[PDB]
Design a protein around this ligand. Sequence first.
Ligand code: MG
Ligand code: MG
Ligand code: MG
Ligand code: MG
Ligand code: MG
Ligand code: NA
Ligand code: NA
Ligand code: NA
Ligand code: NA
Ligand code: NA
Ligand code: NA
Lengths: 173, 173, 173, 173, 173, 173
Amino acid sequence: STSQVRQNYHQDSEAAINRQINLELYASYVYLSMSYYFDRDDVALKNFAKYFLHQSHEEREHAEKLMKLQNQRGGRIFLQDIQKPDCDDWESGLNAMECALHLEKNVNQSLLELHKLATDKNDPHLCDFIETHYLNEQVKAIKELGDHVTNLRKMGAPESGLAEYLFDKHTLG
Amino acid sequence: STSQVRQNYHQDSEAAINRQINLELYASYVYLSMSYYFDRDDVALKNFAKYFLHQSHEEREHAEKLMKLQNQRGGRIFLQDIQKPDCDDWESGLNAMECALHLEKNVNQSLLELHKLATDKNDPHLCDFIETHYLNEQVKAIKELGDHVTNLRKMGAPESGLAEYLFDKHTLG
Amino acid sequence: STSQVRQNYHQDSEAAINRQINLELYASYVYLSMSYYFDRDDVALKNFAKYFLHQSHEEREHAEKLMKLQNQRGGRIFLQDIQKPDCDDWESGLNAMECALHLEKNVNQSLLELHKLATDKNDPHLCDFIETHYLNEQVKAIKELGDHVTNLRKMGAPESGLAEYLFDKHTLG
Amino acid sequence: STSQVRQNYHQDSEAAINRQINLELYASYVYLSMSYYFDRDDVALKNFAKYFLHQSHEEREHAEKLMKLQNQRGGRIFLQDIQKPDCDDWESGLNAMECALHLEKNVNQSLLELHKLATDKNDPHLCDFIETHYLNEQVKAIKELGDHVTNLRKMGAPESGLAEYLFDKHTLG
Amino acid sequence: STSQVRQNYHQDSEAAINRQINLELYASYVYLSMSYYFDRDDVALKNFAKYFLHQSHEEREHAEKLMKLQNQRGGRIFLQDIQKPDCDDWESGLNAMECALHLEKNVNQSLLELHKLATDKNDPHLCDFIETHYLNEQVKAIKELGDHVTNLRKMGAPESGLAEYLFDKHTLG
Amino acid sequence: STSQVRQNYHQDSEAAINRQINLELYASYVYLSMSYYFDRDDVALKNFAKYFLHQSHEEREHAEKLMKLQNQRGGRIFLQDIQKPDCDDWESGLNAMECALHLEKNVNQSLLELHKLATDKNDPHLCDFIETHYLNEQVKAIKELGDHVTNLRKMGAPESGLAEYLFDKHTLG
Ligand SMILES: [Mg+2]
Ligand SMILES: [Mg+2]
Ligand SMILES: [Mg+2]
Ligand SMILES: [Mg+2]
Ligand SMILES: [Mg+2]
Ligand code: NA
Ligand code: NA
Ligand code: NA
Ligand code: NA
Ligand code: NA
Ligand code: NA
């Protein structure tokens, strides 16, 4: 039953990786929803749409890298349903950015818990994997989203539709 | 409530498009599962894995094009859960190819029903969208998968592991 | 007696590094033996020979990097005899691949013990060195060897000499 | 009061980062002093001057990267006075190299304490940041300075002014 | 005790140069603080940050040129502590620009007093050094900062966060 | 039992080749030790280190060519332990060069005895192999090492650390 390659890879770590895969696919789905919200004719913020579509594809890449890791370590991928996102209508550029920030922090928290588990199970390869490929990416993503939210609020989003328009053009464009 | 762009776009068509989006995302998820099955150390068919990963990304593209369609027509995207695939373990290159063929035919059937609905609602734009972007793609994909299955069976898959090895190399490589 | 550069470098870590150097040189020697086994006129698998020769040189590189580390930290290299490999005759491509897999897992285990020691001695530079340069290399090597073994067995190695021939050509060539 | 981006970032870590920023700016100032000591007409070792000026700029870069980190994590930079260096006159190429070595080891010790704090506060992002960007840089810098000091002493520095002259030319030039 | 190169270089001029070096390093430190203030997630004006970082590096260059001068004339550099800047939080783009303008005028005044001393000590080399490298630089910098402040105020900074956003984009970007 | 390719290849020649393989691997190991001795922070002669590392790799190449020979003739490689070198500390550039010279002469003597055996067994292929690939290489290496030793001694090595420094720079650099 044991993979010929498996070494120093705890069942709890394997399970946590499967959970993280699902979470990354979920985040991808959330970003896809946001992107196409901004593609609506009654919202029409092309660069918001592009930004979130880019994030969606990036999250899918993160999930696939975790799947690759799972196979590298001799664990077995078990996929679960990808839940639909919490909203169909994201209301505004600012609200979408805040929800993205919240999502990224939730993903980061899950990654930190995964690192804690890896550390507890004395799995330095897994710890280094998380550090190298995920934790700094998360910190940068959170910082960028925070910068965006700060700018939007100072510009007067979301009540100033001019604010979101010019943000779309000058930051995201 | 009505989109400013909406014209000749029936509610039933909008709903059918949302269903098709979900089905395309589901197919993408199935192909992702198959790809990483072939990436397992105890299966180790790199070109099967690559082939199915390519199909997964292509299905995602199909879903995104349907979402773009929905917004172009002034319908509203409503996402649903993406169900996990039917299998974790796809057993063999041949079995995976047969399941892919079955999936593609199911997707094609849904597209045909969508076309029938479009036709019944006198929506020529939608009809030609389906015809141009989807139906021929499906026919080609089904033909290719059928060719693959035929070759694998004649080669002696799945009991002849040499068969799958050489197919991986010479057809998919 | 203390090196002018030495800082936060425990004697036990220095000794463990010297042991790892020896183990890496040993692995290099094993791979050299395997390579030239496949170069025999009665075995004659040129790409097996090339593959194992590449691995031999890579292991030598790993040893030299550990020696460089030892000097960087102000430890002192103490070399030991490099034991001859366990076999002169590696029997088959499959058997050689299995022995390589076993060897790589043994090297990985030694590296994990070294990381544990570094962690216990609060030596983050050494831990990061092991993580960055060794642990992922080992995981990849083990995964690749496992893929090779899986393919050979499915193809019918080692009784099917056609199996090894075609593997030599299509995977290793 | 809490930054919107802040997550898993302890106040003690924030304070330790501010201290490290100050220490890096201090090291930059020390190297600046040494550089321009060697630029004096009565010392006139152009390549010593260039070497230490390069080190000064590098230390400034290290400080700025720590400031960037502080903002990335949602901590707040608090700058302090940069103390003047301990010497105006560094006496000789050898003495300057020894003082540089001592300084670099002090910086390294501070970084190791910072890593210990990060580890104790379960901050893997901060630990990885220190490991990736600082610890190996410090080990290399210490090794290089030790090599320089060894060469100077063997050449006969600082009493052999020919020694320092030829070292300036052939190693640092 | 007298440098072999020293000629027509008064002790008072040497002391005034040392004071100017300190002032230039101080200005560099102020600009560094401002830059990283604008890099905060709750301020997030990337081009303000870049502008002030550029100014910081330029001020460091000015200090180093004065140190080079000191050695060229055969004076001796005596470094002092670099005081921390007056603020940690610069409040706004406009406020930072006004503080920068005030700082630059203070630096200019010190340069003018230095020139006056040079003139009084009949040091034409020093006078022309100041004139060539510093005074026009100061005049330009003061004019640029004044233009910036004027624009920000007319745009409605600092209460109009849109003002600072668009200034960051169109002037500083 | 006899290789299908074996022709005019005496068992005594096969055994002597196996001994020579071991001797070449031993020489490689000696040079590796010397190289990393010169890489020590308290020795710090980078070009000595590079020179001996080059020699180490060259000796490995010589061993591999002998292994290739063995298989070409239809003999069978039997590897033995590679003994650790006689010293951990090579004391000086001059002492290392003298030990290298002694080693090379020992290798040359073994080659000459091998040639004598080949000649006695009327093996012209083996004789010309030795002549073409080994004997002149040895003569050149011995001459070069002798030149190095002569220069070092005349320069005043090993008591004149300046001697070794300048030799490292100008001959080996
Ligand atoms: Mg505008
Ligand atoms: Mg074939
Ligand atoms: Mg790490
Ligand atoms: Mg010379
Ligand atoms: Mg003038
Ligand atoms: Na992610
Ligand atoms: Na499709
Ligand atoms: Na290795
Ligand atoms: Na530093
Ligand atoms: Na200035
Ligand atoms: Na040789």
